[PDB]
Symmetry: C7
Amino acid sequence: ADSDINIKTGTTDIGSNTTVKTGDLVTYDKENGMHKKVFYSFIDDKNHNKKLLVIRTKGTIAGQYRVYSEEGANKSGLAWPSAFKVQLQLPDNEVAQISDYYPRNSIDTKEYMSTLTYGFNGIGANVSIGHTLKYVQPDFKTILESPTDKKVGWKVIFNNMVNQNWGPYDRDSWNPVYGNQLFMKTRNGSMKAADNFLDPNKASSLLSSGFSPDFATVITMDRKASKQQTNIDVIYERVRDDYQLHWTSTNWKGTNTKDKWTDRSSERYKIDWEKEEMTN
Amino acid sequence: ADSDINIKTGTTDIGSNTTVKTGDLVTYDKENGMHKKVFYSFIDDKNHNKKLLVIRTKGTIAGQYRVYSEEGANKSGLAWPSAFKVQLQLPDNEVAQISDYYPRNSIDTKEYMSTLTYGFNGIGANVSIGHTLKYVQPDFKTILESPTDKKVGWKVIFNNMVNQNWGPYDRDSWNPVYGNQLFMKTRNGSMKAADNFLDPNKASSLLSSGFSPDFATVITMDRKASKQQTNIDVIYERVRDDYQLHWTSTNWKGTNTKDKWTDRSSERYKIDWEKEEMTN
Amino acid sequence: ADSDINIKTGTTDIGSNTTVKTGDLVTYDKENGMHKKVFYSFIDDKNHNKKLLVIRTKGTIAGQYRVYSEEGANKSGLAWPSAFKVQLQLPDNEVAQISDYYPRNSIDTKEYMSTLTYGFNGIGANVSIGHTLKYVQPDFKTILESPTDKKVGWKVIFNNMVNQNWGPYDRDSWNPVYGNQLFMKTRNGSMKAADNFLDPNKASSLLSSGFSPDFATVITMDRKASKQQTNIDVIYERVRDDYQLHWTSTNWKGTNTKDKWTDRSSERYKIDWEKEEMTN
Amino acid sequence: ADSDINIKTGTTDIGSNTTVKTGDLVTYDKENGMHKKVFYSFIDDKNHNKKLLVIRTKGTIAGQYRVYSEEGANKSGLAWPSAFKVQLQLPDNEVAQISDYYPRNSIDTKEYMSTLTYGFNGIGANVSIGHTLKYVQPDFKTILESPTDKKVGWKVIFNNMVNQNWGPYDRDSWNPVYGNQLFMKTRNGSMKAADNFLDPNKASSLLSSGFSPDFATVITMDRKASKQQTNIDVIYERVRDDYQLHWTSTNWKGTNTKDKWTDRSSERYKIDWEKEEMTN
Amino acid sequence: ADSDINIKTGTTDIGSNTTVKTGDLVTYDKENGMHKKVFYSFIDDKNHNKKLLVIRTKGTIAGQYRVYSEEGANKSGLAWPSAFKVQLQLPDNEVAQISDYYPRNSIDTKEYMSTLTYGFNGIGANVSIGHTLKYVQPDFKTILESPTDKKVGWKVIFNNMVNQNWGPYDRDSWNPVYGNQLFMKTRNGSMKAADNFLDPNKASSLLSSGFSPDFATVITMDRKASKQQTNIDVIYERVRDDYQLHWTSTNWKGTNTKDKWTDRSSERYKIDWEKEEMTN
Amino acid sequence: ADSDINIKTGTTDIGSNTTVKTGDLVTYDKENGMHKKVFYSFIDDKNHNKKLLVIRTKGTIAGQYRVYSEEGANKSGLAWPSAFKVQLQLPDNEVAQISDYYPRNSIDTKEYMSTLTYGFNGIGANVSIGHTLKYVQPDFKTILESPTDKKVGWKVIFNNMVNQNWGPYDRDSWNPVYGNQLFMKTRNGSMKAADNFLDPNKASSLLSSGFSPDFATVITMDRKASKQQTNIDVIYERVRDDYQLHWTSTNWKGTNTKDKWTDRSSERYKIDWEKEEMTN
Amino acid sequence: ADSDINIKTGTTDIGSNTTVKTGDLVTYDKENGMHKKVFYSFIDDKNHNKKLLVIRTKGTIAGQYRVYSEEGANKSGLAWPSAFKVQLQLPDNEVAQISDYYPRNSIDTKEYMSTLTYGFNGIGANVSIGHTLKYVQPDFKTILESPTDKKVGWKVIFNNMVNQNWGPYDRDSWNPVYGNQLFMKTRNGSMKAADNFLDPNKASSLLSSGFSPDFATVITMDRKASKQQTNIDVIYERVRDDYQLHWTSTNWKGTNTKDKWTDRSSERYKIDWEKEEMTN
């Protein structure tokens, strides 16, 4: 990157011969089960024209993958985490601005391969033409939602998942006989409906054991501001889907309803640029 | 590179024993949704024969992928980002020149594989000849548009995309029955036209959540110039295509029109070589 | 990571120009066979706003894979480690909090590949459409169980295993003739039941020779706390399953019962923040 | 390399405890569209027996890929860059010599794979023998033209290119019906000839957006020379081919004519070894 | 690892600003052919709460692969190393404890790939379903036998081996006609039995030329112990199997008997913590 | 390597706290077209028991790939570089000895893969057995010719090359109809013989644009020698083959004659150990 | 390795703050063609309890691949290097011991892949079961022969080689018609027998151009020994096989005889521990 322009590596980076005052702030939201942690760092270079503060948004958002209700032996439900989110808003009153962020959106790729085979038999001359196309498919996608001057947020959505080494299924799949078989343990099962869901160990880890963010947003403030103090709000949330499965007198049929419940955990932090410390 | 010519690594690089004065300038263009950020750095070596200034053109250009209009239940439209651009012009009056830039155009590659198989049967001797050819295909292509002494620009164009694990489609594809099926959720669908488009999560990330540049241009100025001050214009823009789909009484047909709307966000920055700071 | 935001590498890390007081505490639980070791480290930065203590939870939990009982020459049993666990609780009375942890849950991935081949014969034109999907399957899965403010734990569960280069079997597999053949040496064997189990060398190493953790939890304490002293409990445990196999007068049939025995080894450690040492 | 002869790494390299005087010289040739840049560096070791000067020949040679003329709706032309060149001559009068250069010619490689399969059928015993051979094919080849004492040059030639995921075509390909279909958008097209060429985005990047060199030549001069001053000429150039396509009343036929136009941009730089600076 | 918790790399490691007193102790056991070497190191940190001593158990255990006896031209034997072992016991009287060890047990992995291809013929519609599963198989497995407070040991067992590019054979393989053909040079051979064994070069290297360990165990002692002196025993051993092959008047039949001979080489070393040296 | 024997990396290397006197000597042989360059370095350690001098034999040997003569429209010839050589002789009178050299001969490798597939049909049980074997084949091979005390040399020979994505032809290939088709553009061509050779761009780069060595030989001299002065001869050379092709009234036939012309460029350099400089 | 036990990297290594006295000793054995070179190094740590001396056994053993005799036009011979060896003996009188050595024996690996495919036809249900197994095969194997207290040696043996892209042949292969065809240029050839051998360029490099060792043995001596002086013998050797081929009036038949000639080059070096130098 920088070395390709004949500039020495690390020349244009910042933070040299200066003292960062790091920190840590841990919260637990027992109502929603969101361990929260806001590691920060106040980088003050005399060369840089603005102060800096990198906010690491570590933590954990618990999956909460469980059978929420059952109605007899022919109907049951399941609530699973459809998407995890982490937002970092900043009041429009304040004059500090978000400078950068990481991770960011990346461009996909796919391999395309084509064939052309023709042979002869001892005359049955044949010709064969074919093309194949391959690409990788993560179970969960870390999308950086579009940022602005005061707001930046991420989300992790549910791409698709392979159910007992059989089919990549997604929230939109539909099969006329069996319905959406995303978390259906057995098709022609004879057990109670409440006990015919995929074992959470068999599923992805993020579904039941939760997703632990690692995100960064550096915010810069003018060095001659009238007041050196800005509050910030950071919001965690998860969106859960209702997966119902019931018996049609011949086989199980499963249906999925998108974005059934969403629970937000919001915390407000006050930043003190002069003291170089921000508090709960 | 440098070590292959028996020269010690880093000998010919610049920026040693000198003080770069970095900086940062953040703007948000709420009309067009273009977060903008112009991290810069003034590298002054006494060995180098000209002053330097590397301009990092970070930011984010929001995707803006949405159904702009609907006309009944048999016609609808879609505006999607065909190409993102970043230009960095310099007035022809000024005597500063762009020195380098990164990234730059790179040479493609493809693998070619050939076969020759002949067998016998217990006599039906056969012969088979075939050749295969494979290469990777990014969804978006980062082309460095041809630079000049005062102007350098990049663009990120739409190569092609795989629609529900079925076919790489591009802006030019055409199928006599269905038309261009780039973002067509269902072929023989029975839903409202406005609700028959590919879900933005299913698409590429850059389409809906935006593209965040990371580009660099070092500009050099003569050290004995009469006036040590030059203004610069940096332009962001995105080009949107209109994707229309309608019902032909039997199946959906979709058409794509290229370069329908383009919105430019231009900002002018004044550079002060003597003070080593450039302002909004 | 940090270098992508133009910050110099290692700027925002902690532990510079400070003296960590490391340590070590080894215990052996001969009743359950759990070698235990709690390497710790007291990192005190004057810049950081809280004290730190990283707790490495190394050790070893022995596999204990053996034939626990035999009942004649037509019935026998096997106890094998279904899952190893490591928990690190903290009394809710104390004001120290767990800050971070490693390893953490990671997002899976799978490759999807599609084909489309059509040929001609000398006319028998054919068409072939196919898709393949591949992914890796570890024998044991290291899941980070959902953490909280005072409690963090991991577990290592049994995914599946390939029995004599023949089939990946798991705890839930069932075959109507042979039953669950997870550890069945021979199908139509004629030996004693006690001597018809898979040789422990042929199995995975973790089944018989044990699993040695390597986990980390940093806990932070407020620097102006009223009392600088907190005790901690760390718990190891393994969960064993009963694998029974018997003769049906024609072939062996094997059945597996989940979570038969669980044995916990709990130890309490007292931390002294002022002295920077924690004792057994 | 050097470490394999038991010599410490970097022992035999040069440039230690010395001061290189780097530089930069930017030119733009608006007639031919060749951004030009001659980053240099004067490495003077007291241990080395000759002075050094590494000349980096960065820049950009614009592709110039456009329809130069059209003659009705049944005939048109296209001029595309067949080869980019960069030469660095030195007058035979001068006593400075080119010492090294980079990149240099490299030896190709190919994988050879052989098969021998024989089977039986329930007796139709068969035998199958086959061999496959694979290798990579860059679109453009960077050949170091043979250097001499006073002259060194590179060139980047057109290997071949895949046209709409169909066939690797080169300048020499010929098909009796369609002719050379290197840049033919459609075979049985019905559009104007001027609008039946491959879209420049679909082509390689180097064709339309240009090629940016990165080459190095260190030249050494005797330290006791009578005059410490030598001028140098550096030449850029591109070679364009005329691609004509016309209608044969049934389908398009395309023909390519090699080395139609070549445009050279020559600049002369005067080197001053005593002052350690070279000027435009 | 450590850098992921925002701690600077190497902060929590030990051995800074201290003087380790290394050493070396070489023994040769000509009766059993076991070159033995116990490189050690006394790491004394004033920060660490216990003294350290890392014991490297290098050496070599000769394979001893030879025809031990022959009984005519129709019967012969072979003794080959079934498993090499290295144990490091510590008397239960002493108060020093083994702290860590390396290498340790690792979790296996396997790739699972599934297919689903259906085509049509010009109607003979077919469907094809298949799954493949691949994994690597070392010839010898380095198992860490379960350690305790006073005892830690490793072993290297014989997984399986490919006999003349034909079949992966193991100690348990059986073929009703030929028996266990693990080291059988020819099936329908006509040579003397003593000369019908696989050439030791064709086999694995570890069988005939021996296995050289590289293992480490750090043992820690309380710093205020009453007596600073502990003796240690380190045991090498190899287990040899008897592979017999004889003529059945039509073809060779070979049988393998497990764990026939085991030879142990035990040495006792006295550690002097105060002097920081341990002797033979 | 060195770190595996518990010795610190770089401990046993040489060249510490000493001053190497490097240099450079460039020659051009316009008669044979061999750019020549003899970068050297005088490493004098007071610990080492002998002086050192590493001789880098860089340069370039031009390919000289051209049609040397033509005899009508039915016969022509071609001279191409069969092998490049670089020798570094030392008079047997002198007492300096060559110490090491790089590159050196390396051991090849090949992958062997075997199959065993048997299926059933609905009974036509079949069995299939096959084995495949693959390895890479460089176009030119860099063989270190066997060195001695006073003479060391390398050579680069012509392995084989793929002619227009068709067949790996070599110098020894023969086809009864067409002869050796190594550089035959067209089989049933109708052009002049002089214009029926493979285009030099289509061939390997080393054939026409030349091969640039990078070789090293350290020579050591006794420190108490009677005379501290030795001359050295370094020889470049290329061997050219005559490739003739002529018309047999039906198709072209090509023949290759091995080692037709060889041209040597020899230079003598005088080394002065006391002054630490060697001259042309 | 060392960093996994929480010890800082390089803590337990040796050679810090000490002065190694390296050296070099070159010999050429013109009778056997064995360039010999014994780079050494005397590492004296005050922490280490014994002196050290690492002996690098570089050099070159010429291949000597030539037709030794011919008997008419129907019989000829070939002597080729079957195995190269390097031994480093130490008199049993001396009290110095070999401490370590490198390289050492390594454990092989192989990939096992299994398939299970069953399809249906439009009913001809079929089932297919197959397994494949792959591994790499070096041409020459570097086996560390079993070391002892006073003697350590290596050898490089001939694994197998592919003859004109046709079959991997070894010294033991036999074909009833053609015999061992290891170096047989043509089967139904009509040339003189002396000119029907594989061209040495077509063979492996080690056969004709020689094998250059790179081996290390550190020997340690007690620091309070009565006499600080030990002599050492280092032996090179190569073993040559006689490959005869003759005409059977229909086709060539070739036979190989193992270990025909062996030539040893022995040199004795006297080590002076007090002076830290060893002489020829």
